[PDB]
Structures are given as structure tokens and as C-alpha cells.
Amino acid sequence: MGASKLRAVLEKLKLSRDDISTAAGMVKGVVDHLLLRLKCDSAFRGVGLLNTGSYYEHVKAPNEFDVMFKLEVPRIQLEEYSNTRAYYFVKFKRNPKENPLSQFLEGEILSASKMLSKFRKIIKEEINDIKDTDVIMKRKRGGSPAVTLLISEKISVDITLALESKSSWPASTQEGLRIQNWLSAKVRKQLRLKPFYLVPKHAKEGNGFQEETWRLSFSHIEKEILNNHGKSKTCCENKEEKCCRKDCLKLMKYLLEQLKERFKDKKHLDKFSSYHVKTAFFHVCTQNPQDSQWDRKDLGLCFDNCVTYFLQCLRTEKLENYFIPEFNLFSSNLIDKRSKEFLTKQIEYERNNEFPVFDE
Ligand SMILES: Nc1nc2c(ncn2[C@@H]2O[C@@H]3COP(=O)(O)O[C@H]4[C@@H](O)[C@H](n5cnc6c(N)ncnc65)O[C@@H]4COP(=O)(O)O[C@H]3[C@H]2O)c(=O)[nH]1
Ligand SMILES: [Zn+2]
């Protein structure tokens, strides 16, 4: 696949400033209103908008948004659930004083399902006729921590609640974030000093679910790594140091998106998301730390590599969480073999035929 061809694909995917500003405007309005109302409750008094960009989370329908609501919770003690390395029970190190979330305390362990239920109930109750815009809440997805809204019957916004911990990161993230040879150890050091988040996601237990667990989240770190991606600090700040990392990520995401859209009737690709792609891309970034390995003239090659590695992850059924190395996103427990084989087939076909799926 030619680099000029790929860059032409990315070129035709660019949206005008008007659409971006309009959609961002509507989303911002709804979000701000929901914050102002969410602060009416003592449990969600310290709620706030977490900076993850909140834009460009969909190349092309680019009306789908993703915002994250951080909730500052002080002095929490985490307990790793069944060595899942990613799912924890939330407790409090010292709780003599009445906790704002005490209404959600199922004993010593903070209930995730109750907080999520309350959150969803507040939002659902306060998106009706209070807005000079038409907002509807989408059907509750199975085991999804997100609360999705539809604005003006065109804009989708995923709202995820997240507990915030300014404590040091869990021990499961010790060997994670291998950006030493890429973004330097100093950057990793200052990054690990930043807080980490927890989303109300239950873990699988054979043929049952816990609903009391929370999953680690480092979306903000992902944003930071994304916007500052070069070994050189001046990467992509001049013509001589223009790389093709972001182009590769965009192309991968668009490939997965187009494949998911094409086989929407089937249920094979439903569990696959742009996060898997992003993770694989991060691993590839670790494998190729030099900016010279991401030269803009080698877009075709680099992207190819990004495809190949992704395929490897599908074939070997191994895709380690970039922050939690022992957490496998492509385990057989999460995604079945048949789905991964299907995706593999579609991708191999696309690459073998000069990506006809980009022609739309
Ligand atoms: N900003 C943010 N949103 C999250 C996070 N975790 C879940 N969400 C939201 O809930 C939706 C479904 O969550 P799921 O955990 O039940 O299945 C997810 C999960 O299995 C996996 N995944 C996505 N982000 C992940 C993440 N940050 N960590 C671990 N797994 C993740 O891919 C599935 C679909 O992701 P999606 O990006 O299209 O939408 C998320 C996403 O909009 C999160 O950590 N950060
Ligand atoms: Zn760059």
C-alpha cells in the first residue's frame, strides 16, 4: 500500500471546523449541564470532567463522543480480586468520619453497581426537558460502565464514571508502561506520579459476575502519550522531524471501524474496539522507539507492521494491557477464538487486496 494512497485516505477523512465545533458545542452543553446537576448530590459533589481530549474519538460517524467523569475519592484502599491484576475492591483506609459514598457501602467494600445505578438514574432523570436540546438515553448495554446519550438524534456521547486515586499505582502496573527506551525513564517517572482512575466494571468469575469490582483506567496517560509521542521533543514540530505514528493509529482505527461497520449484522466484531488497536499500537511504539523508524515516507511500511503485529495478537491470542502486562485483552475468556479468526480473515483479505474497505 502506497504512502501517498494512505495519506489520501486520511486526507479525505478530514472534517470541516464547522461540524467539529457544532458537535463539540452540543456535547459541551449537555456535559456541563449534567455536571451542574450532578453536583446537587452530596455523593457526586466532587464530580468533574476528566481531561482525555473529549474530541476526535471517531475518524468518520464522527458524531460519537467519549467523555469521562472523574470523582475525587480520598484515602482508598484497593484489594486485588482473584489475581485478575486489573480488577479491585474499593475500601477506605480510615473511615471513622461519615463518607459521602457511605450510601453505596455494601459493608466494607464500595458497591460499583450501586454507584453506577445512581449515576445513571441521575443522568436519566435530568436529561429530560431541562435542555433546549433533545437528549435520550440509550439502552443499557450488558456489563458496560458507560452511560450513552443521544443528542439531537445524531450525536452519541459515552459518559464513564471514574473514581480518582492520587495514591501510587497498584503493584500490577510495576512492569507496565515500558516507555524507557522510547519516551525516557524520567517521563515514565513523572507520569507514574499522576493519579490513576477506576471504572465500575465487574470481572468474570466462571459463569458469574462480582459487580463489586472496579477496573484500572489510565486514559489520561494514553492521551498524554498520544499528544507527545516522539523520542525527540520537537517531533512533528517541523518538516525535518515529521513522523507517521498518528497516521498509523488513525489508519488502524479506521480499518477496524470500517470492518465493524461492514459486518454489523454479525456478532463477530462487537467485542473488538479501538482500544485494542491503540494498545497494539503502543506495543509497536515500544518495539520501534526511534523517530527514524516512523519516517513519513515509510507510512506504507510502518502501517503494514502495525497490521502484522495486530494480526499476531489475534493469532496468538495475546494482547497485554500496556499498563497492566499480566492483563490479557485477547484472552479466550474475553473474546472467543472464532471471532478473532474472523477478524483475522477480514484483515488478511484487506491487506492482500490493497484495502478495498478504504474506498468509501
Ligand atoms: N474513557 C474511558 N472509557 C471506558 C473505560 N472502560 C470502559 N469504558 C467505556 O465503556 C464502554 C464499554 O466498556 P467494556 O469494558 O464493558 O468493553 C470494552 C473493554 O472490554 C475493552 N476496553 C475498552 N477500553 C478499555 C480500557 N481502558 N481498559 C481495559 N479494557 C478496555 O473494549 C470494550 C469496548 O470498549 P469501547 O471503547 O468501545 O467503549 C467503552 C468505553 O466507552 C476507561 O477505562 N476509560
Ligand atoms: Zn511525531
Swiss-Prot record:
Regulation of its function: The enzyme activity is strongly increased by double-stranded DNA (dsDNA), but not by single-stranded DNA or RNA. DNA-binding induces the formation of liquid-like droplets in which CGAS is activated. Liquid-like droplets also create a selective environment that restricts entry of negative regulators, such as TREX1 or BANF1/BAF, allowing sensing of DNA. A number of mechanisms exist to restrict its activity toward self-DNA. (Microbial infection) Nucleotidyltransferase activity is inhibited by different herpesvirus tegument proteins (Herpes simplex virus 1 tegument protein VP22, herpes virus 8 protein ORF52 and herpesvirus 3 tegument protein VP22/ORF9). Viral tegument proteins act by disrupting liquid-like droplets in which CGAS is activated, thereby preventing CGAS activity.
Known outcome of mutating residue 194 to E: Does not affect interaction with nucleosomes
Effect of residue 250 to R: Loss of ubiquitination by MARCHF8
PolyADP-ribosyl aspartic acid: residues carrying this PTM: 32
Residues recorded with modification N6-acetyllysine: 223, 231, 233, 253
Site (Arginine-anchor): 94
Motif (Nuclear export signal): 10-15
Protein name: Cyclic GMP-AMP synthase
Organism of derivation: Homo sapiens
Gene field: CGAS
